[PDB]
Symmetry: C2
Subunit: 117 residues, 2 copies
């Protein structure tokens, strides 16, 4: 419930890069970036620009999640796509969050352990 | 336009948890909308959410029609007051409330940026 709020704030901050909205709470989440190849991101961005939509990101977030590693990768690709699509992108972020949390809510306990245990 | 979506999410989340490390002066003009909302309409909504153990009544309030910028400011203000008064412990899927809020008020984002700036 802290996780829901934190991940929303984190993905919105990666989107706009406004440093008045930075928070040290994000530092441990930035470390998930190593799980994600920047060519998978570059391809997603190209597909979102070709479809003029979050469509391809929603498809990536609907891919199944089996463990905390898949969760960290799903948060990281959300974050990298949020940064690289640019602050002007009129994305319904609530639609991405709805799917992200449907897939990773089960693992919120396992994720708080990995971060703060 | 993308700015309004981000700002209103950050504002409603901040009213919910009251964490002062997430305060931003950008919220100051949104706090002014509070005068449009009677604290007895809020008290009734909170009571109905606690009696039903659900966001049900908030989702119903956000589904009431929006005809002008005034209705938008009132809808943002009641979201915000409910977020503060329901408490940080409340297991609310905030994305579900944002989905409805933005279905109703996205049309008026341009009129709302004018009013604010």
């Amino acid at each position: 419930a802290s996780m829901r709020t934190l991940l929303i704030r984190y993905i919105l901050w990666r989107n706009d890069g406004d440093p008045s909205y930075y928070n040290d709470d994000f530092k441990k989440l930035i470390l998930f970036d190593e799980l994600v190849d920047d060519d998978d991101v570059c391809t997603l961005i190209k597909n979102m620009r070709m479809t003029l939509s979050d469509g391809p990101l929603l498809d990536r977030l609907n891919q199944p999640v089996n463990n905390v590693e898949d969760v960290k990768r799903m948060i990281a690709i959300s974050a990298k796509v949020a940064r690289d699509i640019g602050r002007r992108s009129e994305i319904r972020w609530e639609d991405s969050f709805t799917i992200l949390f449907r897939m990773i809510e089960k693992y919120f306990d396992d994720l708080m352990t990995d971060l703060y245990g």
